[PDB]
Design a protein around this ligand. Structure first.
Ligand SMILES: Nc1nc2c(ncn2[C@@H]2O[C@H](COP(=O)(O)OP(=O)(O)O)[C@@H](O)[C@H]2O)c(=O)[nH]1
Ligand SMILES: [Mg+2]
Length: 411
């Protein structure tokens, strides 16, 4: 029925990660949105840090682009669809919004925006692994990762980034492109507007001090500061102020808007567009290929097989995963091209085509669609690629078959 948060990936108590593929397919494989280039916005962070709360206002904005006052009526309590849904009942894992959002970039492109909520605990390793895995995945998939910290970017906050740098540096060498898109530090209750101002301007001078290496204090947090900037195309920071005390000292805050502090609402109002304004949306791209919702479904499947058991994958294994998904996505794109181009000539209905003619069109469009497959960059390497080549040839042969059926409907 109506939209709500659907728990697509969950961490099992046995330390294994189960991905509800079916729900993922309902959402991203729907015909309306399947073929759209995709923006994947994820918020990740500790439990009980104001994530859902924020993500509300992200929905309020998405369902109300037109409004100047999407934030809502001040004398009315906050209402609308809710990420908090059933109160937690909190478990490490990833939630996505049941409704994908369709939006036009300034250049007329109709993109799909996917909202991810990433919940995990960050305290004990047997509990960090899962979190760092959920975090890994979350970041791997997302085009935009907003990292939701409480009061400051702390060393332990920067620690969870360690897992990427190893994999980044590796991916970077093999692809010759930086591996991740945008990472955003969202500092939650900033209390030094006199040291750095709230919002992006100020958030950025803050992040520059915090990320600068060689307090001499840091240890192998040096390694992260050293390489963090090479792994991410862009890294930014937003200083968000305290919601006021009615919001902080209450669970499932049911108050009216006026209850929320003014400077929190002031700044919340620039923040959300900042992240999800049409100009600000960043299309997910791996290797320099833009990714399709269908395409994105491949990367889920691939990365999930990797994080099985307590042991975490080595960059090398992750890398190989990215190769699978990257290769698969090329198949779908090339097969889509063949399929859609064939549909004109063969016809959704009409008109008649002589058997030998269908033959000659098919194999040229098959050879040429295979060429496009070869054209796209492949993570793994030709040898690794070649197994997928066959798959594409085989998937096209079965599409050919289906098209002789249709063709052979002219008496
Ligand atoms: N101190 C503080 N508390 C907040 C903020 N935003 C929300 N809260 C409150 O903190 C509690 C946890 O927020 P919640 O939405 O459940 O975040 P989540 O549990 O991480 O998804 C809720 O009762 C909120 O009412 C914030 O920016 N600062
Ligand atoms: Mg949440």
């Amino acid at each position: 029925k109506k939209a709500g948060p659907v728990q697509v990936l969950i961490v099992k108590d046995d330390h294994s990660f189960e991905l509800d593929e079916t729900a993922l397919n309902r959402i991203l494989l729907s015909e309306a949105v399947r073929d759209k280039e995709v923006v994947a916005v994820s918020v990740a962070g500790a439990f009980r840090k104001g994530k859902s709360f924020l993500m509300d206002f992200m929905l309020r904005y998405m369902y109300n682009q037109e409004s100047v006052d999407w934030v809502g009526d001040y004398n009315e309590p906050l209402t609308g669809f809710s990420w908090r849904g059933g109160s937690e009942r909190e478990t490490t894992g990833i939630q996505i919004w049941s409704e994908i959002f369709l939006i036009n970039k300034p250049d007329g492109k109709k993109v799909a925006v996917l909202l991810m909520d990433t919940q995990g605990t960050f305290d004990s390793q047997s509990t960090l692994r899962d979190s760092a895995t959920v975090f890994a995945l979350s970041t791997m998939i997302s085009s935009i990762q907003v990292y939701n910290l409480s009061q400051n970017v702390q060393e332990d906050d920067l620690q969870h980034l360690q897992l990427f740098t190893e994999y980044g540096r590796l991916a970077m060498e093999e692809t010759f492109l930086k591996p991740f898109q945008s990472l955003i530090f969202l500092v939650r209750d900033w209390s030094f507007p006199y040291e750095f101002s709230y919002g992006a301007d100020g958030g950025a001078k803050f992040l520059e001090k915090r990320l600068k290496v060689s307090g001499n204090q840091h240890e192998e947090l040096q390694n992260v500061r050293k390489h963090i900037h090479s792994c991410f195309t862009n890294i930014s920071c937003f200083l968000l102020p305290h919601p006021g005390l009615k919001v902080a000292t209450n669970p499932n805050f049911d108050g009216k808007l006026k209850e929320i502090d003014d400077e929190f609402i002031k700044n919340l109002k620039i923040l959300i567009p900042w992240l999800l304004s049409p100009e600000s949306l960043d299309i997910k791209e791996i290797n320099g290929n833009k990714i399709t919702c269908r395409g994105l479904v491949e990367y889920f499947k691939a990365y999930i097989k990797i994080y099985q058991g307590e042991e975490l994958p080595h960059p090398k294994s992750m890398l190989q995963a990215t190769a699978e998904a990257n290769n698969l996505a090329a198949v779908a794109t090339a097969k889509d091209t063949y399929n859609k181009k064939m549909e004109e000539i063969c016809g959704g209905d009409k008109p008649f085509l002589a058997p030998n003619d269908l033959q000659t069109k098919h194999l040229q469009l098959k050879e040429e669609s295979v060429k496009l497959f070869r054209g796209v960059k492949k993570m793994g390497g030709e040898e690794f690629s070649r197994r997928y080549l066959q798959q594409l040839e085989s998937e096209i042969d079965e599409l050919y078959i289906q098209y002789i059926k249709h063709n052979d409907s002219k008496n």
